[PDB]
Scaffold this motif. Sequence first.
Motif, PDB file in Angstrom:
ATOM      1  N   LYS A 195      25.574 -32.801  21.002  1.00  0.00           N
ATOM      2  CA  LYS A 195      25.420 -32.019  22.393  1.00  0.00           C
ATOM      3  C   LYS A 195      26.602 -32.274  23.065  1.00  0.00           C
ATOM      4  O   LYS A 195      27.383 -33.251  22.653  1.00  0.00           O
ATOM      5  N   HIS A 196      27.104 -31.616  24.022  1.00  0.00           N
ATOM      6  CA  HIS A 196      28.326 -31.884  24.844  1.00  0.00           C
ATOM      7  C   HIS A 196      28.320 -33.045  25.830  1.00  0.00           C
ATOM      8  O   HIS A 196      27.336 -33.041  26.399  1.00  0.00           O
ATOM      9  N   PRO A 197      29.314 -33.757  25.778  1.00  0.00           N
ATOM     10  CA  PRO A 197      29.331 -35.112  26.503  1.00  0.00           C
ATOM     11  C   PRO A 197      29.255 -34.738  28.209  1.00  0.00           C
ATOM     12  O   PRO A 197      29.074 -35.708  28.787  1.00  0.00           O
TER      13      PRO A 197
ATOM     14  N   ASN B  79      24.111 -43.890  16.193  1.00  0.00           N
ATOM     15  CA  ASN B  79      25.260 -43.916  16.752  1.00  0.00           C
ATOM     16  C   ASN B  79      26.498 -43.926  16.091  1.00  0.00           C
ATOM     17  O   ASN B  79      26.767 -44.585  14.871  1.00  0.00           O
ATOM     18  N   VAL B  80      27.616 -43.153  16.498  1.00  0.00           N
ATOM     19  CA  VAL B  80      28.803 -43.337  16.025  1.00  0.00           C
ATOM     20  C   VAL B  80      29.587 -44.331  17.147  1.00  0.00           C
ATOM     21  O   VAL B  80      29.578 -43.865  18.207  1.00  0.00           O
ATOM     22  N   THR B  81      30.396 -45.268  16.778  1.00  0.00           N
ATOM     23  CA  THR B  81      31.124 -46.029  17.476  1.00  0.00           C
ATOM     24  C   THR B  81      32.660 -46.074  16.720  1.00  0.00           C
ATOM     25  O   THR B  81      32.550 -45.870  15.564  1.00  0.00           O
ATOM     26  N   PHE B  82      33.532 -46.277  17.385  1.00  0.00           N
ATOM     27  CA  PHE B  82      35.097 -46.547  16.911  1.00  0.00           C
ATOM     28  C   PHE B  82      35.536 -48.068  17.238  1.00  0.00           C
ATOM     29  O   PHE B  82      35.045 -48.730  18.211  1.00  0.00           O
ATOM     30  N   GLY B  83      36.119 -48.676  16.281  1.00  0.00           N
ATOM     31  CA  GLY B  83      36.813 -50.075  16.361  1.00  0.00           C
ATOM     32  C   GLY B  83      38.356 -49.978  16.111  1.00  0.00           C
ATOM     33  O   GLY B  83      38.877 -48.863  16.405  1.00  0.00           O
ATOM     34  N   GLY B  84      38.885 -51.017  15.821  1.00  0.00           N
ATOM     35  CA  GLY B  84      40.224 -51.147  15.492  1.00  0.00           C
ATOM     36  C   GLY B  84      41.437 -50.704  16.558  1.00  0.00           C
ATOM     37  O   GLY B  84      42.478 -50.096  16.333  1.00  0.00           O
ATOM     38  N   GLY B  85      41.099 -50.874  17.874  1.00  0.00           N
ATOM     39  CA  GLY B  85      41.693 -50.442  18.912  1.00  0.00           C
ATOM     40  C   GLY B  85      42.013 -48.749  19.125  1.00  0.00           C
ATOM     41  O   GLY B  85      43.152 -48.593  19.491  1.00  0.00           O
TER      42      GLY B  85
ATOM     43  N   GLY C  52      39.313 -41.810  17.733  1.00  0.00           N
ATOM     44  CA  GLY C  52      38.374 -42.054  18.757  1.00  0.00           C
ATOM     45  C   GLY C  52      38.022 -40.731  19.375  1.00  0.00           C
ATOM     46  O   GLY C  52      38.386 -39.806  18.751  1.00  0.00           O
ATOM     47  N   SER C  53      37.150 -40.741  20.396  1.00  0.00           N
ATOM     48  CA  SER C  53      36.732 -39.231  20.705  1.00  0.00           C
ATOM     49  C   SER C  53      36.432 -39.224  22.042  1.00  0.00           C
ATOM     50  O   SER C  53      36.194 -40.353  22.728  1.00  0.00           O
ATOM     51  N   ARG C  54      36.570 -37.922  22.926  1.00  0.00           N
ATOM     52  CA  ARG C  54      36.330 -37.767  23.921  1.00  0.00           C
ATOM     53  C   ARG C  54      34.881 -37.773  24.351  1.00  0.00           C
ATOM     54  O   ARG C  54      34.503 -37.893  25.472  1.00  0.00           O
ATOM     55  N   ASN C  55      33.887 -37.703  23.338  1.00  0.00           N
ATOM     56  CA  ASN C  55      32.511 -37.898  23.689  1.00  0.00           C
ATOM     57  C   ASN C  55      32.529 -39.630  23.280  1.00  0.00           C
ATOM     58  O   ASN C  55      32.515 -40.069  22.443  1.00  0.00           O
ATOM     59  N   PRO C  56      31.931 -40.156  24.705  1.00  0.00           N
ATOM     60  CA  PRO C  56      31.867 -41.658  24.574  1.00  0.00           C
ATOM     61  C   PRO C  56      30.914 -42.073  23.555  1.00  0.00           C
ATOM     62  O   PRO C  56      31.003 -43.377  23.312  1.00  0.00           O
ATOM     63  N   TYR C  57      29.616 -41.370  23.400  1.00  0.00           N
ATOM     64  CA  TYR C  57      28.636 -41.902  22.987  1.00  0.00           C
ATOM     65  C   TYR C  57      28.172 -40.955  21.930  1.00  0.00           C
ATOM     66  O   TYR C  57      27.031 -40.395  22.091  1.00  0.00           O
ATOM     67  N   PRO C  58      28.822 -40.539  20.976  1.00  0.00           N
ATOM     68  CA  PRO C  58      28.297 -39.312  19.705  1.00  0.00           C
ATOM     69  C   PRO C  58      27.079 -40.084  19.021  1.00  0.00           C
ATOM     70  O   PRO C  58      26.955 -41.215  18.706  1.00  0.00           O
ATOM     71  N   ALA C  59      26.153 -39.212  19.033  1.00  0.00           N
ATOM     72  CA  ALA C  59      24.747 -39.767  18.321  1.00  0.00           C
ATOM     73  C   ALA C  59      24.013 -38.796  17.655  1.00  0.00           C
ATOM     74  O   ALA C  59      24.015 -37.492  18.080  1.00  0.00           O
ATOM     75  N   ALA C  60      22.865 -38.987  16.812  1.00  0.00           N
ATOM     76  CA  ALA C  60      21.948 -38.207  16.299  1.00  0.00           C
ATOM     77  C   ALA C  60      20.652 -38.975  16.530  1.00  0.00           C
ATOM     78  O   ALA C  60      20.728 -40.129  17.029  1.00  0.00           O
ATOM     79  N   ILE C  61      19.553 -38.302  16.430  1.00  0.00           N
ATOM     80  CA  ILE C  61      18.398 -39.040  16.651  1.00  0.00           C
ATOM     81  C   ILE C  61      17.439 -39.128  15.269  1.00  0.00           C
ATOM     82  O   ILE C  61      17.291 -38.088  14.546  1.00  0.00           O
TER      83      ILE C  61
END
Length: 558
Positions: free
Chosen positions: A204-206, A288-294, A299-308
Amino acid sequence: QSCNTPSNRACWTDGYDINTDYEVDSPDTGVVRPYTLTLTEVDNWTGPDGVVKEKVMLVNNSIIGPTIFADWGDTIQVTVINNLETNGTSIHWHGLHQKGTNLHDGANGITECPIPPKGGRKVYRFKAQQYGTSWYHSHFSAQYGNGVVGAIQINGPASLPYDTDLGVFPISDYYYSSADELVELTKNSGAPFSDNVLFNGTAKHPETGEGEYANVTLTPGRRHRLRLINTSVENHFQVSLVNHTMTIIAADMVPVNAMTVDSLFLGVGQRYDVVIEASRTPGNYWFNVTFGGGLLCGGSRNPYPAAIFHYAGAPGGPPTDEGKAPVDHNCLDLPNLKPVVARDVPLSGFAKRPDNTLDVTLDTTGTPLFVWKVNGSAINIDWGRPVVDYVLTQNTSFPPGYNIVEVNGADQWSYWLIENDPGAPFTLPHPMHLHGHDFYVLGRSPDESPASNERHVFDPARDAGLLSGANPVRRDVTMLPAFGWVVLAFRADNPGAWLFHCHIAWHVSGGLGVVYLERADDLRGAVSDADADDLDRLCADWRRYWPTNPYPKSDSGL
Ligand SMILES: *[C@@H]1O[C@H](CO)[C@@H](O[C@@H]2O[C@H](CO)[C@@H](O[C@@H]3O[C@H](CO)[C@@H](O)[C@H](O[C@H]4O[C@H](CO)[C@@H](O)[C@H](O)[C@@H]4O[C@H]4O[C@H](CO)[C@@H](O)[C@H](O)[C@@H]4O[C@H]4O[C@H](CO)[C@@H](O)[C@H](O)[C@@H]4O)[C@@H]3O)[C@H](O)[C@H]2NC(C)=O)[C@H](O)[C@H]1NC(C)=O
Ligand SMILES: *[C@@H]1O[C@H](CO)[C@@H](O[C@@H]2O[C@H](CO)[C@@H](O[C@@H]3O[C@H](CO[C@H]4O[C@H](CO)[C@@H](O)[C@H](O[C@H]5O[C@H](CO)[C@@H](O)[C@H](O)[C@@H]5O)[C@@H]4O)[C@@H](O)[C@H](O)[C@@H]3O)[C@H](O)[C@H]2NC(C)=O)[C@H](O)[C@H]1NC(C)=O
Ligand SMILES: *[C@@H]1O[C@H](CO)[C@@H](O[C@@H]2O[C@H](CO)[C@@H](O[C@@H]3O[C@H](CO)[C@@H](O)[C@H](O)[C@@H]3O)[C@H](O)[C@H]2NC(C)=O)[C@H](O)[C@H]1NC(C)=O
Ligand SMILES: *[C@@H]1O[C@H](CO)[C@@H](O[C@@H]2O[C@H](CO)[C@@H](O[C@@H]3O[C@H](CO)[C@@H](O)[C@H](O)[C@@H]3O)[C@H](O)[C@H]2NC(C)=O)[C@H](O)[C@H]1NC(C)=O
Ligand SMILES: *[C@@H]1O[C@H](CO)[C@@H](O[C@@H]2O[C@H](CO)[C@@H](O)[C@H](O)[C@H]2NC(C)=O)[C@H](O)[C@H]1NC(C)=O
Ligand SMILES: *[C@@H]1O[C@H](CO)[C@@H](O)[C@H](O)[C@H]1NC(C)=O
Ligand SMILES: *[C@@H]1O[C@H](CO)[C@@H](O)[C@H](O)[C@H]1NC(C)=O
Ligand SMILES: [Ca+2]
Ligand SMILES: [Ca+2]
Ligand SMILES: [Cu+2]
Ligand SMILES: [Cu+2]
Ligand SMILES: [Cu+2]
Ligand SMILES: [Cu+2]
Ligand SMILES: [O-]
């Protein structure tokens, strides 16, 4: 006859199981799996999150191509038809070791010339002497960022029982700009955030909510294999399934002893096979996809990329439990995976020397601003004069940009200390990838946040204890830590010209790679008349096409 069942996935056939040394022995099925893949160029394409992209480059009319299915021991034969408008293409079978088939590796400028556009074609042929999850992608500069990607699923045994194989689940960064636009950008700016993250080609588009979540169905109570692949050009992902663990059973193409985790770091090009038990309350759960390591490895412009992930029989709609963020993985992959087929690497008298050290450096003193180098040279090949053509014509006058690193001696062990720009003011994590081989990770600098600015420079006296040859992690992509180092080894069991490079498309485009020229004399002696004929014909066709191309080669070519 097969003995591979839900309760006994370790067994494959009589004489073949999870403990078989697959680098020596594979079933001789006598089966050939032919596939045809067709590349097309599409302008003003409506993508899966609703945004219209200026230009995409598709395999069989999708940004994820058809999956190459085979069984362990089969022969795979892929006809690639390049119906793009201007670009050449070369399709690399990432993770397949191409043992004795170097000229089918699909690395343009290394093992072949590119396939000309407007109907060029060639046939790749190689053996499934491994089993597991891999992927294919263009190696023509950063072209795969436009959509020239697909999965590879070679069935075989597994290190845990499971009921159902859910199949490949590629996860990729997604940009509205084209790959060539992003190469131009990253010559003089740092890597941008992705615009979205696609799970099996959808999201989905964020902001607008257009599009759809990927929707993976779990059977209540059952054990499911999920074949994770990071097919990105730059984003490194932390993945987690709300309220569920994942039990790792393979890393890249190497089965491992089961390891249960709450979340998982997938570098660019890494795969993990995991087993998920659907033992929770039936419902819908975010993947969920999340980003670490500073954000230093994405990183992504979608703050909460995810599948179901949906339990069969449960209600529809989106999950309602947002879950908790996973631990920060620090842009680092697991250091303690244990291959099922255990191997010891000799580690007697190892020491840092000029002939076993490769320093990755960033040169920001010239034009363009971001020039990546290995041992002081940015890789830069000529698509029309591939490495293996030098070998076959016995021409040793490689241009300096070919970054040739000779590895000689049948069955030798080849050791490499990879240093991340010692003394530099700023460094980045790098997903380092070796063609033609799995490597062994003998050790690496102490785990840190890449944002901590804590430097670790390998000290042979002080750091021997960090190295071990006792069944090391064995795979084909691993992380070079920020401000740190990693020691890798591989066996010289596969004559060929093998690229070793950072898998961030912007970095290898910008010079970050070398070519291991392994047993060149043996390679020349083993190349069949047919392989040499096909090399020469395609290179003649490419060289006739290239002067008519309206665009220059913009980068390393890789
Ligand atoms: C992301 O999107 C993609 C694209 O839409 C999705 O791709 C789909 O992925 C499916 C899972 O891989 C895949 O299904 C497979 O399709 C092929 C047909 O070409 C078929 O061979 C497979 O059939 C097996 O599995 C089904 C259950 O799904 C069984 O009912 C069936 O009997 C087959 O079972 C055998 O193979 C399995 C491994 O594939 C074994 O787990 C199973 O135990 C059994 O193996 C035994 O028998 C064999 C023969 O007797 C023997 O050789 C072996 O040794 C064992 O003894 C399956 O249907 C879809 O084709 C695929 N679709 C496309 C378009 O590519 C993908 O799912 C999405 N990802 C997610 C996570 O949702
Ligand atoms: C990925 O996409 C490609 C298409 O881009 C898929 O390949 C096509 O598969 C479909 C069937 O699913 C075929 O459609 C049929 O075409 C019949 C006519 O075929 C002849 O004429 C074609 C036009 O000149 C020609 O391309 C084709 O040659 C192909 O097969 C020959 C026989 O093996 C071989 O000599 C060539 O190498 C070439 O591959 C034939 O001479 C038509 O009568 C039917 O009604 C139907 O439309 C296409 O022909 C296939 N096209 C090609 C180029 O192979 C491919 O399967 C997809 N891959 C996956 C994994 O899904
Ligand atoms: C993800 O895919 C699954 C399919 O595997 C979807 O699950 C299906 O969801 C529908 C509702 O959207 C369920 O039908 C409903 O059933 C109830 C009771 O029978 C009925 O009252 C409703 O009117 C509706 O018909 C269906 O049972 C369910 N299927 C399974 C196998 O669980 C799910 O909706 C998809 N999720 C998304 C977000 O697309
Ligand atoms: C896993 O992915 C899901 C799906 O993207 C994430 O759910 C999202 O979580 C955010 C953060 O809380 C929600 O934003 C909030 O929305 C409410 C309602 O509009 C608002 O009041 C808050 O100020 C905030 O903006 C978002 O709505 C929600 N998305 C959906 C579709 O439910 C989830 O957080 C992710 N989990 C992890 C651990 O990353
Ligand atoms: C491959 O095709 C792409 C798409 O047409 C070419 O990309 C263009 O490259 C020019 C020159 O650098 C840029 O000015 C355009 O902005 C690019 N367009 C897009 C849509 O990205 C690319 O040059 C081609 N590469 C080769 C080697 O032919
Ligand atoms: C590094 O480059 C120098 C030349 O600058 C060369 O002499 C040396 O062999 C190279 N080392 C490797 C491992 O390729
Ligand atoms: C060998 O390669 C060099 C560099 O590409 C080239 O200039 C030279 O002509 C080649 N020699 C032959 C005999 O082809
Ligand atoms: Ca510098
Ligand atoms: Ca001939
Ligand atoms: Cu790759
Ligand atoms: Cu590769
Ligand atoms: Cu890099
Ligand atoms: Cu590569
Ligand atoms: O690659």
